[model samples]
Target: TCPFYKKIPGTGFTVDAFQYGVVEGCTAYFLTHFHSDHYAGLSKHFTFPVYCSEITGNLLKNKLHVQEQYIHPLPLDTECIVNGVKVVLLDANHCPGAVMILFYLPNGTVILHTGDFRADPSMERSLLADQKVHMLYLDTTYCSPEYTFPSQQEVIRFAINTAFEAVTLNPHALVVCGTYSIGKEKVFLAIADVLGSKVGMSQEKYKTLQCLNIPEINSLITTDMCSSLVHLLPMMQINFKGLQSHLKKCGGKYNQILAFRPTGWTHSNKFTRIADVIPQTKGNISIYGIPYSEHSSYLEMKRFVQWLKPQKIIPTVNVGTWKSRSTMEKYFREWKLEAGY
Candidate 1:
């Protein structure tokens, strides 16, 4: 009923005495990132109690298994409190269980939010020298100026030199790509540390990269034990009939097959026709855009709005929509406008 403020009727709202149905009069619901657009609408209006970060409660109970029950799991620049509000969370390096909350409010005000952030200078020098934020709520999803991105070490060296030029122009190739199984485990550990090896997983992503101890850049395989590397799937699960039955049981010993889908595949038409049904035989199927997004781009959202000079920034997630709310009210009218809210 409160689809984030019922689609904004008269913005001066109410819905917060513990959010309407008042289960023991409000005070929790924090969550900064286990991104399904920030915890999938709190699994039906959060029956109170919600906090976050313990790697967002083990990626929401082991990668969205979701067994709710008043969530609550903090630790990452700790600071709990609750009914009288306090919060904290922080460290939103985008994925690998993202975060970023802060709150505060005992009338002294503070806020922060951030949710989908990425101004990585090691997450802006570990949150601007740890503390001192007044009202950020940022993540202006690439705030205008025709968004741009690259550099996650240059898209992991252009997806490991385009999968080693599609396996050196096809010496019996089988390149495959696809990402996101817990947000592209650091681009599959940067293509297994630039193809030295180790990138194939599916024992449910190797038990979620062995419960996030996530190592092994020279020997990791799955997809029914990828016959010797180059079978990296999980761009939302791309099997393609077990890769055409492992290219007809490797008799033709791999003629050539490079696949890709590294994230969103350009915002769907069913993931661009399921990544164009991957099967372009000898040295083909090379869809590598490599933007490496985890939000924050338009010059890192104008240098995080000029280093948090917020007085009233609020562009939270593409500005509470209305077709991008006048492109975030033109960046809150180019900054400046002090004197308290």
Candidate 2:
């Protein structure tokens, strides 16, 4: 469930509230991304005019089979007036089709709704650099100080090294990469490119890539399982039992399985070095949970908030409980103070 209220204040718009059904006093709807959590309530029957990035709009039509007429794809970095309120979309850097919405209310207040984002250096050059944001609805998925991890680039490099080392030692090893349908494409793509192997994926995912703007993806991915040593699978299938099942299902073609589960939860402060994040092994199967997260790390979020210095901050994730909200507020307060707010 969403931690914050669905309706944005001082507007006839609702952001990511399709799960709650039709909301009262809302004239339009806004979808920041295509993540299941954000678009949970959406279905083919949804009637409200849904505003989102062009890529996201296509995903709605292709994946969920939503009607095309109801889907409104706004151009990135361009302003569109909806019901007298101005709106703009900026790249969120979280995943494909993700965006951080900038809402310019008639009352002269500026609100930025960061659907789900990983703070990147490129965002500093966005239109937001010149304007003042009055309210910020931020993605607080990793807002705590303890959630710090390496950057996506660093983690991707580590995965390449780890995969290369594993395959070098065991050439017959099968490399499996755990990934989401939308996010974490960079990790597997890098591995496939460096290793010089076509990545294997389900036909559904292969078709989904057609909608994505990934370069040379048709040659990068293969639907034939036997054609590729590196397999791109759903994150849920990375567990020991799942891996074992997959190994057995493959009919012993591989001598060993070298799997990588890229996620932020695997690496913590307790693990000092990258080498310290040990792999879990049972017989010939090994699963390495790399700290490869799409969400912004704690430091990144802090830096982003400090740079923006929004007048008010609203936590979007992990705000359901009082304790969680207070803990996030502490960090938000610290960041706000650092920004001289």
Candidate 3:
């Protein structure tokens, strides 16, 4: 059962768990990414082989203290077998090390779990043109029509451009962008490298990036001194407090602080969910909400389904019940895809 993180009775892999309820009776675990939602109940303990992307494995090894012996870092696109099912880790294009799992069952049935990803042409072609998916577990974070948004490349470009301009306008100003501890290193690197500046984060952040073994970021990380004017801050902080505390000690050093929040929430048209990401002028902080999401929009999901044409679709993100089942059937029936078992 992918989850509630349960084992599919006989399969070798059970996905994403922390407690016995999720990991019980499972011979091994397959992690999609380092995201808390997927990696819950797995830290500080592991009884079986934990399969995941290389970076994710490192993150767990360093951050969660999972034993190296228990962690199996899978190479992207390479097929490996567990308990008679062949598995491949496809690039999910969602985050630094996110992966979409493809399982080829002995029954000649192929199953795919899209572990929180945005659409990528390479992954699409790889799945649609090369493989046949009988069942697909979709991310479906934005599974409706109103979630129209630009591609991640577009958003990243905007982020880099916006940060570049802001920094150009105010060279002495500290540009602090928010991000998770592991993902979004690309944006930080772009902002820092293009401006010919360095990046800094907390000790935990520094260690996480260091584990990636990038020569430049390893040397470029400056902390405890606020030496780097460009703060590669945590992108997920609320009320701008985490980064603010870091900037508090050196309040007098910079003339301004610019916060670039990269997310997909701002690009939608029919959202009454409040402005999670929007541009505003807040005193010294010029906040710009970038449409930088790593999940597929509804249209993107439609396009993906149209291309892949899986026989049955299963959602992997949120709520899955008969009540949620009716919602899925109603929403996706027009796509001409089957839902539920």
Candidate 4:
């Protein structure tokens, strides 16, 4: 499992939660964001009031049905004492409600847990001018140097415009948009607002949006399948089989469907994007998989590490593997490490 707990040296506290089998006699648990990979094990039996943002806390209680008492909201930029440890949560610049954990340890050492965040200049300044970070627990998700990406806004702009172009050309087709359980809400809202279309969602996803209480999106989600101008289904829904017949079964509103997936993985040379374009009997359904990631590039990683200038580094994603070892080793070598204990 990619998820594991790490005890802060001499702090007697551990961050993140797996299962009882993985972590025993848990310390203060910290959930950075609600992404499933990092959020591996969650259920009824797991009863620990972990600290997280309001949105994350809401999701856990409303969706996963985790007991209310077991979830605590950690407001952004607020320094508070949690279970005898001084901790402050910062704007992670990742997904909505995502945060980076900063510990002002009792022993006068500073540690930063960058929970899947992109570097933001304001947050850098959020650190006290005189405060120096002692240890860095980094998120090396995009650790590969070759993985360069455009800004999330730029990528979202490109994908939305591309989809708009496709929709105009193929009026008879439904625009099948693929998304994970979470993330990509911005894309959905963009389509609804700019394109003047209501996005379709199942009841469960709709409830998730309702729980978010975001006025922009809560007002935009639709359950009606036929009236849904932009169909907002998971990536798993895009299939070649009898999809045409399935379309015909509808009120004969759209003759075809344009399938698309928006994600950062599209830019990487390593992985093949799901399907760029698919030829259909009626008309070709234009498809594209683009990157709109909230994670930092290796370049950003280098810059952040250099500026913070911590004496030690700890990659948060994993251990005993090349990803955590070799990837971080490269970053450590290329970036300048500032000295002074």
Residue 54 in model 1: lDDT: 62
After the best TM-score superposition of candidate 1, give how far the Cα of residue 16 lies from its true spot, in angstroms.
29
Ranking by TM-score: 2, 4, 3, 1
lDDT of 1 by residue, 195-277 (tens): 55566555676665554534452355554544554666556444555455555655766765566565531333223332233
lDDT of each residue in 131-225, candidate 2, tens digit only: 89999998999887778787777787788888888888888899998877588888888888888899998988887877777777778888998
- Report, for every candidate in turn, its global Cα lDDT versus the true structure: 0.57, 0.84, 0.71, 0.71
For residue 276, model 4's alpha carbon misses the true position, in angstroms, by 12
Task: Point out where model 1 deviates above 4 Å.
Answer: 1-52, 56-72, 75-85, 88-96, 115-134, 148-175, 178-199, 202-224, 227-230, 233-253, 261-285, 290-292, 296-310, 314-330, 334-341
Q: What ranking of all candidate models by lDDT puts the best one first?
A: 2, 3, 4, 1
Task: Give the clashing residue pairs of candidate 4, or none.
Answer: 49-70, 173-256, 263-291, 264-291
lDDT tens per residue, model 3, 1-341:
23542344347566665554544466777888888877877766665788888889888898899999989898987878766678888888777788888888777888888888887666656744686778888887888666777665666676677778877888767877777645666666777777777787777777777777566665666765466766765556524555456557676788777777766664344663233445667566677766666788887787787778888777765565677666766777777744222
Per-model RMSD to reference: 16.0, 1.9, 3.8, 3.6
TM-score, prediction 1: 0.36
Cα miss at 91, model 2 (Å)? 0.4
Tell me how many clashing residue pairs each candidate has: 2, 0, 9, 4
Which has the higher lDDT value, candidate number 1 or candidate number 4?
4
The TM-score that candidate 4 achieves is: 0.87
| Candidate 3 whole-model C-alpha lDDT, 0 to 1 | 0.71
